[PDB]
Amino acid sequence: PGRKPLSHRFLRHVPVVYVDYPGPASLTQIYGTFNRAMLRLIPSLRTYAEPLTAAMVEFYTMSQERFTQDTQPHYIYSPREMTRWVRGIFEALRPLETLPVEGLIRIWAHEALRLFQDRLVEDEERRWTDENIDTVALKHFPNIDREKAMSRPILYSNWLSKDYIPVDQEELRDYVKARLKVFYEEELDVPLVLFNEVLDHVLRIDRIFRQPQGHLLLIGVSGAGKTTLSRFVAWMNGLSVYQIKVHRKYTGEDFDEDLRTVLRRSGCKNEKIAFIMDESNVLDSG
Amino acid sequence: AGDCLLSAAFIAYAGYFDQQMRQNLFTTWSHHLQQANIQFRTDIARTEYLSNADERLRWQASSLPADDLCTENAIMLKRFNRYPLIIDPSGQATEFIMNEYKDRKITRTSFLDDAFRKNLESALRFGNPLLVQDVESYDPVLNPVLNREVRRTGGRVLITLGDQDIDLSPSFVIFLSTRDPTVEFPPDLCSRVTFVNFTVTRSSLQSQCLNEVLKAERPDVDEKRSDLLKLQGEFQLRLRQLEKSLLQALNEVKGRILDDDTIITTLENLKREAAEVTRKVEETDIVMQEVETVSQQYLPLSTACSSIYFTMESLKQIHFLYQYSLQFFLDIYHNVLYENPNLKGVTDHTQRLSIITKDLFQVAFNRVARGMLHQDHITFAMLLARIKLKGTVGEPTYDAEFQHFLRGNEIVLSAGSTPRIQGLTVEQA
Amino acid sequence: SPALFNRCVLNWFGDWSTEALYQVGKEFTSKMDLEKPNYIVPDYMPVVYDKLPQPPSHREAIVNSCVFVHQTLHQANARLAKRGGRTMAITPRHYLDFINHYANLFHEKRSELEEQQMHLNVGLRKIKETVDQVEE
Numbered sequence A: 001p002g003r004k005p006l007s008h009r010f011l012r013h014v015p016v017v018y019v020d021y022p023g024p025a026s027l028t029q030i031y032g033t034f035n036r037a038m039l040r041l042i043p044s045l046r047t048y049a050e051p052l053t054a055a056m057v058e059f060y061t062m063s064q065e066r067f068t069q070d071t072q073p074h075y076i077y078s079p080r081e082m083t084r085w086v087r088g089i090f091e092a093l094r095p096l097e098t099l100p101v102e103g104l105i106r107i108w109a110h111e112a113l114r115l116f117q118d119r120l121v122e123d124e125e126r127r128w129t130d131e132n133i134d135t136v137a138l139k140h141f142p143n144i145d146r147e148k149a150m151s152r153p154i155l156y157s158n159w160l161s162k163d164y165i166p167v168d169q170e171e172l173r174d175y176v177k178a179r180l181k182v183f184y185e186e187e188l189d190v191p192l193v194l195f196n197e198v199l200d201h202v203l204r205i206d207r208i209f210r211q212p213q214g215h216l217l218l219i220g221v222s223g224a225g226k227t228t229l230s231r232f233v234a235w236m237n238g239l240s241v242y243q244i245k246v247h248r249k250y251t252g253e254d255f256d257e258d259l260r261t262v263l264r265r266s267g268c269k270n271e272k273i274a275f276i277m278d279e280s281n282v283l284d285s286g
Numbered sequence B: 001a002g003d004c005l006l007s008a009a010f011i012a013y014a015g016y017f018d019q020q021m022r023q024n025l026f027t028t029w030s031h032h033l034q035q036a037n038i039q040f041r042t043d044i045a046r047t048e049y050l051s052n053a054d055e056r057l058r059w060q061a062s063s064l065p066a067d068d069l070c071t072e073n074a075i076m077l078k079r080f081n082r083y084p085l086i087i088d089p090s091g092q093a094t095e096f097i098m099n100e101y102k103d104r105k106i107t108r109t110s111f112l113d114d115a116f117r118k119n120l121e122s123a124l125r126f127g128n129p130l131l132v133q134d135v136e137s138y139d140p141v142l143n144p145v146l147n148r149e150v151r152r153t154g155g156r157v158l159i160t161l162g163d164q165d166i167d168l169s170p171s172f173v174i175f176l177s178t179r180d181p182t183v184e185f186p187p188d189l190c191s192r193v194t195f196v197n198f199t200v201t202r203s204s205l206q207s208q209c210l211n212e213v214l215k216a217e218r219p220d221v222d223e224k225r226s227d228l229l230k231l232q233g234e235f236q237l238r239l240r241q242l243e244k245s246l247l248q249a250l251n252e253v254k255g256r257i258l259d260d261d262t263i264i265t266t267l268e269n270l271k272r273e274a275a276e277v278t279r280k281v282e283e284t285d286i287v288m289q290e291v292e293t294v295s296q297q298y299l300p301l302s303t304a305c306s307s308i309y310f311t312m313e314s315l316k317q318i319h320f321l322y323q324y325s326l327q328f329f330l331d332i333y334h335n336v337l338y339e340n341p342n343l344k345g346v347t348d349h350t351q352r353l354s355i356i357t358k359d360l361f362q363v364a365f366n367r368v369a370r371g372m373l374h375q376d377h378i379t380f381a382m383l384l385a386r387i388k389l390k391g392t393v394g395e396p397t398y399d400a401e402f403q404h405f406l407r408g409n410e411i412v413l414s415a416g417s418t419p420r421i422q423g424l425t426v427e428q429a
Numbered sequence C: 001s002p003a004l005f006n007r008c009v010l011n012w013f014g015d016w017s018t019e020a021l022y023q024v025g026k027e028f029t030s031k032m033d034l035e036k037p038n039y040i041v042p043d044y045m046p047v048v049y050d051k052l053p054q055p056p057s058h059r060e061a062i063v064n065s066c067v068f069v070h071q072t073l074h075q076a077n078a079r080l081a082k083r084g085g086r087t088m089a090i091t092p093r094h095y096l097d098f099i100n101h102y103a104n105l106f107h108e109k110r111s112e113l114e115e116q117q118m119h120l121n122v123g124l125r126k127i128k129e130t131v132d133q134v135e136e
């Protein structure tokens, strides 16, 4: 979508090549190099670098086999997903030391859940993916104890303790309840009642915010709570919130200006910015 | 609790739906509450539970139709949390909502004008209401006020409009209003309004038609159903006011034995009222049953009436000159109820109903055909004829015969088309 | 846009589940007085599979009725879409609006009825005093 075929008068001069997604062998090699570099931080797991990488590649394969663009437009899959997978695993492993294979596979499964499961729509797809992750973990790691995969919460949060560590659902629920008490005590006077889904979403939003990424796009029905949770998480992590209040006579030069304002408040000043906006703000493809 | 749940679900969810859909949803909710044994008052009417008589008379004096759907919509406009969005092909709702808030100096505006912003904050400062027309081109600048965000700080209420910051004056209400019944709103704007629908459908027009014919032909049944409607809250309020008058009289006269006569009359008067109310309660079901039968007696005509009117509207398809409005059919019905030469001395209720039906068909056909092309007259007749066939009893629907006559003749049966006899031709065969 | 749909991480904030609606109803209707000791326990009416008590009491019955109302609205929208069309989307903000209206209307009705009852009691006491005066 949004692509126009080039004129034959211009295509005559320019040769073109088709750069397809790297094949299974290329993917295995490229991310095996990354895994072998990453796992050198803790020498206790070096010999498990080769299967883990393969597991990732294997998972990606069926994660590319189903979720075609016909089913849903956002069901796309590229090596960028594997890159974010490796980067997230490395980010979690960076401050922590002396980890057994238990923690490695636990965080591998957690990253798989956050990258290949939260984008899905219908429940059968979600349970299919969860079954796929646990089966693949058993296939390339049958020697491991079934103590990490069956863990149904499998949620991490650095809010408790001092680093990115697995946390029980109930204690995190109590902590986030206290923090949200403090939250709507200060602005957003409307009460916020927390179910399971909002807890999952605040954890995911915080995980995306913490990493040095560039965006976090939310897909869902109106009033479901995307914006309020975005603001709440921004309040947790000390993220300033910028809302562009568009109108009928709004011009793209204004969008360039406030983009530059966000960029200067984020880069020239180390203040971390969470700039939130919706469809009513977008008018043209510019 | 159950009655409250039903009323709230109606005034919050049962918007944008026609009268039949609202009734169906209410029936489903009440059936579920019965399944859950939640004590909700049987056969409650939401028209008077959410507003007593006084508001109804004020709305009627405020240029509002007596339609049941219109009364429910007025209730929705009176009790709303999210700012309403009025949908009405006619201007009755807009005129009603102007006339209702003349004291609060309601202002008119629209999205298309360039001064919508200016009168918007001008209404925002003095707590002035703002009705905005032509909602199809929605202004995103209305998002902060629809979400009712309050940036209260320093003991005062504030709001952000674009780069400007304004003081949110209380007693400020905004009523969104549209003209086109066929428009698809984005879900973001849909979630922020309580849809109030004034569009006339088959069920709403049938209800209006039945109410009018009941009021005209049998005023006694109309009085009985109005009495049933008032019996929930209005009679109790009147009895309470009479009791308060009794109390003030008693404490003013200190119960003097010389004043006893003036007390006694009042007392017995009150008893009579109570007795009357009690009698009404003791006959409620019976009265209800009677009304039902009368409705079941007048149900066909109303349905036919509805059908007829919609046929008239659909007549715009054949020719561009056949545009007809609800006012025309309402005039036709008013003529066929009151100004009838055939109803000068008729007294039998069933005979009056038959005469009304026949003369309605006749007058409708005549008035439509006076402004119709000659080649179409017969067409219209058949349509009314078909309606009559649907309205009559003791006759088969003839659905298969009519489907064959209209569209069933064009089916694939060319195979085995024998010439048959010399009289038959190939097309005849 | 496949490019934007790949350049970031996508999260499907789907519609509120039945458990979410039930919890929202329970927390937003807590201040209300809905304790009926003599509430008989019906059969059937499943809406929330994880009913907090196996035999539901009045409060859980009411919140179950509220979530059932929301699901019936969803089903009515789906049915109207199937037969023809012309349906507006139903969102959890509608559920919040429904709960807020129900709470406010219950408070108003209960306050009015209690005021009428207290007026009745005041009248009873005053008329007893007048009866004593008449006896004297």
Ligand SMILES: Nc1ncnc2c1ncn2[C@@H]1O[C@H](COP(=O)(O)OP(=O)(O)O)[C@@H](O)[C@H]1O
Residues within 6 Å of the ligand: A190, A191, A192, A193, A194, A195, A198, A220, A221, A222, A223, A224, A225, A226, A227, A228, A229, C024, C093
């Ligand atoms: N978990 C929740 N509990 C209570 N209310 C919620 C919850 N999530 C969302 N809301 C309500 O939704 C309303 C608006 O949500 P919003 O962030 O605008 O949703 P969206 O991002 O879909 O537009 C808020 O007023 C808030 O009260």
